[PDB]
Structure formats: structure tokens, C-alpha cells
Symmetry: C2
Subunit: 130 residues, 2 copies
Amino acid sequence: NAPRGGKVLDTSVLVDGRVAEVAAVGFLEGPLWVPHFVLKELQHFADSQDPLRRAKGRRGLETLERLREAAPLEVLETTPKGESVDEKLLFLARDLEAALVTNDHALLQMARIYGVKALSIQALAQALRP
Amino acid sequence: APRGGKVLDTSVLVDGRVAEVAAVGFLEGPLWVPHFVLKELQHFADSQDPLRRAKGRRGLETLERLREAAPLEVLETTPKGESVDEKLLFLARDLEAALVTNDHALLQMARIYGVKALSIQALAQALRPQL
């Protein structure tokens, strides 16, 4: 299973921010999909009076805006299967035949067990370290 | 925009990191290696000079690792172009693939020819932690 259906992005990678530069440099082939709930999460963070959580919801969003430059990015309103965030991302990735893009340790594990391709920005980074 | 895969030159194979990139999922195929690139790596490995041999081995080693990470085909005839640069550029255009290279100057040449080209070194820079 080698998915040409693009990429489903989670909160962690948008908060990390680097996915945006990886796309622009040509190593993140689209289409790029973000679930409605991920966005719902970045604004629940953005709506914080706590500057730390504010400044990271704010950050996820800027990453989105910058991605909508490198590539077609589209928000998925349509998510039917699954109860937890991790579970919804997985069936989402199988449905579109797209890879997950996430730094999340538990989600990367669930994906190996499901056999869903998942791309980790941190694993990419640690491969290219000096 | 190119949906036709990734043409790999000699320099990217000798650099080796493209093998790290593919094995973590960020080098989507199909992967194409021109015959002249494979011929050149073989010519390095067979050289009298221990340092040419090491580059040759390293690129050959990288090629085998890529063949594990994704589907890879050696394309065994090019007619478009006169220099190695041109051959790589026209081939990538013909395949609607991106060129992947370590060679700074070839990256600029691709810009001039209107061919998409990817740099492992620009990727490594994108991966500087932010915020």
C-alpha cells in the first residue's frame, strides 16, 4: 500500500509548523486534507486566555495558511467513522488512500497496527540531523 | 505540481541522505534512474582512486536502499539533450517528474528550463525547528 491520495494532517504537525516548509520545498505531495475537528481544535486553543495555548492554536493556523500556498489544501467537513480523534484520522486516511502526517507517538503506533502509512516530521528531522 | 515521480542524478545518490528520506516516507515514487547515472556510479566503484571508489560504492549502496523504500526503474536510453544536465532536465520534463539533485548549479538550470527540481539540502534546512 503506497498512497497517492495525498495527506491527512493532524494538530501536532500544524503546531510544529515545519510541515509547511517541507511542502514548499516539494517533499509533501498533495492533495492536503485537514479534518474539520483539527481546525476545531486549533481554534479551541486559539480561544485560550492562556498565552501558551493561544500562541500554539495561532501557530497551527498560520501553518495552514502557508500550506494553502504550496499546494491545494481542503478542509474535510465530512467525517463519519470513529469516536476519538486518532480513530477518525485513521479511517479518514484509508478512505482517501492518503497518508497520515503526524508527530503524535500514540497515533503513529495505532497506524502501524492498522497498516496506515503515516509520515512523521520529527522522524524526518532526526534522519537529516548533522 | 509534477505527478510523474522523481528522477535521481549521480550527486543525490552519492550524498546518500535521499535514502534516509525515502525510508521515512517523504520521497514518493515512482523513482527513475537514468542508465548513464548507474553507469557513472559503476565507473566510480571501479576506479583506481580509493576516493572515487568510496563515492561509487556510496551511490550504489543508496540505490539499493531506495529500491527497498519504493519502486525504482533504471531508464536505459535518453536521446533529448547534449550535456548530462540537459539529459536529466529533458528526461524529467518528458516524464513529468521532478528532478532530485544535490548539485546546486543543476537546481538553477532546472529553474531556467522550467523543470521542477528538489534539493535534499533545502529539505534539511526546512527541518530546522521553529517557534
